[PDB]
Design an enzyme around this catalytic site. Structure first.
Site, PDB file in Angstrom:
ATOM      1  N   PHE A  78      87.858  22.669 -66.527  1.00 40.12           N
ATOM      2  CA  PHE A  78      87.912  21.855 -65.724  1.00 40.12           C
ATOM      3  C   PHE A  78      87.513  20.801 -67.679  1.00 40.12           C
ATOM      4  CE2 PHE A  78      86.609  18.002 -63.021  1.00 40.12           C
ATOM      5  CZ  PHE A  78      86.181  17.316 -64.093  1.00 40.12           C
ATOM      6  N   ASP A 101      86.115   9.277 -73.168  1.00 40.72           N
ATOM      7  CA  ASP A 101      84.985  10.379 -73.516  1.00 40.72           C
ATOM      8  C   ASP A 101      84.699  10.862 -75.033  1.00 40.72           C
ATOM      9  OD1 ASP A 101      86.958  12.046 -74.618  1.00 40.72           O
ATOM     10  OD2 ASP A 101      87.748  13.023 -73.401  1.00 40.72           O
ATOM     11  N   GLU A 104      79.358  15.624 -65.712  1.00 36.44           N
ATOM     12  CA  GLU A 104      80.632  14.379 -65.712  1.00 36.44           C
ATOM     13  C   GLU A 104      79.534  12.729 -66.419  1.00 36.44           C
ATOM     14  OE1 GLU A 104      82.529  15.590 -68.087  1.00 36.44           O
ATOM     15  OE2 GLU A 104      83.306  16.820 -67.726  1.00 36.44           O
ATOM     16  N   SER A 131      84.727  36.891 -75.467  1.00 39.99           N
ATOM     17  CA  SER A 131      83.420  36.175 -74.351  1.00 39.99           C
ATOM     18  C   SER A 131      84.393  36.755 -72.593  1.00 39.99           C
ATOM     19  CB  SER A 131      84.017  34.403 -74.513  1.00 39.99           C
ATOM     20  OG  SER A 131      83.051  34.177 -75.404  1.00 39.99           O
TER      21      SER A 131
END
Ligand code: CL
Ligand code: CL
Length: 162
Positions: free
Chosen positions: A104, A20, A11, A117
């Site tokens: 997150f 972002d 990050e 998955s």
């Protein structure tokens, strides 16, 4: 290496409001403020988060305080989610960190969308889960970060981060 150092690598740290990778107002260590295109809306979400009048700027202590809350929130969001929690409980400590990284970044609902998955991860079919995780908007929009997390799930080591 641990979840905090991992996320800090993926990050970065920025002390002023920035957009972002999706174009959303963000601050600190990947702390999303708002998806609204208004910087005023971002600034007001920021003041609310920090509890003072920031004018778009925060200190390191403050960035690190949001980060702690966001990591804790991610963990707690996995444990309360009925699709995620059993997969997380099945995993070793390194691969757990990979799961938290994903939540997150994209949220508990986004990850719970990785049904196939998640099932391959629960069964410890690592090469297969890695292939399937890569067939994703996530992998195509942020391939370097997604490759590091995928490698973590595949190997159960921190190699992608060293
Ligand atoms: Cl907050
Ligand atoms: Cl990336």
């Amino acid at each position: 290496m641990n979840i905090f150092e991992m996320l800090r690598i993926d990050e970065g740290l920025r002390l002023k409001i920035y957009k972002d990778t999706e174009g959303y107002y963000t601050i600190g260590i990947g702390h999303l403020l708002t998806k609204s295109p208004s910087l005023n809306a971002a600034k007001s979400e920021l003041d609310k988060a920090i509890g003072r009048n920031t004018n778009g700027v925060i200190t390191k202590d403050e960035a690190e305080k949001l980060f702690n809350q966001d990591v804790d929130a991610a963990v707690r969001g996995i444990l309360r989610n009925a699709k995620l929690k059993p997969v997380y409980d099945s995993l070793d400590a390194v691969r757990r960190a990979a799961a938290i990284n994903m939540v997150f970044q994209m949220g508990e609902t986004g990850v719970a969308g990785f049904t196939n998955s998640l099932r391959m991860l629960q069964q410890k079919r690592w090469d297969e889960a890695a292939v399937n995780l890569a067939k994703s908007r996530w992998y195509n929009q942020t391939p370097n970060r997604a490759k590091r997390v995928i490698t973590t799930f595949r190997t159960g080591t921190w190699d992608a981060y060293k």
